[PDB]
Write a protein that binds this ligand. Sequence first.
Ligand SMILES: [Co+2]
Ligand SMILES: [Co+2]
Ligand SMILES: [Co+2]
Ligand SMILES: [Co+2]
Ligand SMILES: [Co+2]
Ligand SMILES: [Co+2]
Lengths: 282, 282
Amino acid sequence: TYTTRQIGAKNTLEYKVYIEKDGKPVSAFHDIPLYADKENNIFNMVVEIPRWTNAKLEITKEETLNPIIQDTKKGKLRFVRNCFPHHGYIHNYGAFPQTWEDPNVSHPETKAVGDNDPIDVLEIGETIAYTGQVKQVKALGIMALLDEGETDWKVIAIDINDPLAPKLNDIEDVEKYFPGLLRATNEWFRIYKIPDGKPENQFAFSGEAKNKKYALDIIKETHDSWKQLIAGKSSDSKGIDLTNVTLPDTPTYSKAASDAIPPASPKADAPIDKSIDKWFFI
Amino acid sequence: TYTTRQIGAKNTLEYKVYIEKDGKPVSAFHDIPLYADKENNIFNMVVEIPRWTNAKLEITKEETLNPIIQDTKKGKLRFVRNCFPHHGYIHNYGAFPQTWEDPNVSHPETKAVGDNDPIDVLEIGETIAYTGQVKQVKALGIMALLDEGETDWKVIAIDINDPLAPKLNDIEDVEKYFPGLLRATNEWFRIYKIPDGKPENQFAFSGEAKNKKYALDIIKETHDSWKQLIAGKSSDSKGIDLTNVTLPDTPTYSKAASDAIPPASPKADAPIDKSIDKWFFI
Ligand SMILES: [Co+2]
Ligand SMILES: [Co+2]
Ligand SMILES: [Co+2]
Ligand SMILES: [Co+2]
Ligand SMILES: [Co+2]
Ligand SMILES: [Co+2]
């Protein structure tokens, strides 16, 4: 039974959100299982960023129990800018716990090393999610973004509770029920860092979304990368905190870690600089 | 200086926002001057609905001093739905005070009666506005929307404080600095009530955005209609409350109507039903 523990105010450097199980903090990266229902391929997705928000929140690989925090660049909080016709992120954006994009392996499909993080998930249902939420999704397909230098797969998924879930089984169903969303996804991921002064990104396979089956393989390749990583195996797993309070056959189990987390101390959201309102025409 | 007086929680039926001058309420329809700078055609815009919001907040024509109150449909709060690729309204949305789309005559450009409300304004600058804000804008152009069969011109304007204001002088400058915005504006107003079960609206002139000179002429016409209305000379003023505290030559002048308003009693924004999150693919 998953809930969240918030420390500080949203949109500040001190903001942190931990995932709790029956009231105690666990690691959002290694303690919540990849599958909610392995037999039916129902996954747990940890949500980082709600649709139509800008603050770039991310599970932190460098802190104990991997809380969700706001990304920073040279000390400054990171916000994605609004890129016309889009507002903020256009999906509920998160990742699957227990996955890793191996930074040491050149991918056959894409020709680039993995990005070193859990695999990214775009959840396309109607309801806006919340940071730190653990929701159950079905995988519909996958796109191969090359985020300047590296392979950064995006899984396309839908909350099993969405009113449309029963009718959405593979990537063609996204075209039918959410026409234009795959094109918008392609566009968004190509240009989202342009306002920040980075180049446009590119996609492998000329931007096509691969189907559910290709998606499930890739998902599996990343969770097996995750396996090597957590078991001490890895030419370079450096900088990642592996404490877990649920999973013993690894060196790094510590139930004391769950209790070393500060109690919740949620403050009202902090204001966001008015410049984040701006709509960029690029 | 104009400020606002809020009564209740936003997103509730009791919510009301009156505009005040010197800490005292005035009519948001009749008592804010159309022009902030007549010689330079600088106008006062009354903002009702901030960009990327959904609550259909409007100046209330039939209530004394015309506070902004959320519209209702069959008794329930009205929210415009999200129409993909858009999120709520895609402009800061409001009206010019002291204007009226006369509903008693057929307008020659559109061959349709007016919609009975102040002329509406789309403010395109980067800063998201707030409800009850009076800002000063320059008119750039105007589009001839026939909204559910009624003349419902949409003026295109920009806050004079926007960083780009000095570069925006006429309608072609909007395509230069905001490429795609006018086309998206035509699509938005065509489709936005389809999720409500209404037909697609249409535009006169094939949706063309006429220029500043054309816009000033239509704004003049709607100011001339309001002067007739406020003098008590319209053939049918539709039950509009004509109470005002600043126009002594009108029959409905009353400086004491200001004092009859309850004091401010703001509450925290109330939650919005999660159904309003939904993205509709038309
Ligand atoms: Co990620
Ligand atoms: Co990634
Ligand atoms: Co209306
Ligand atoms: Co209006
Ligand atoms: Co209308
Ligand atoms: Co109107």
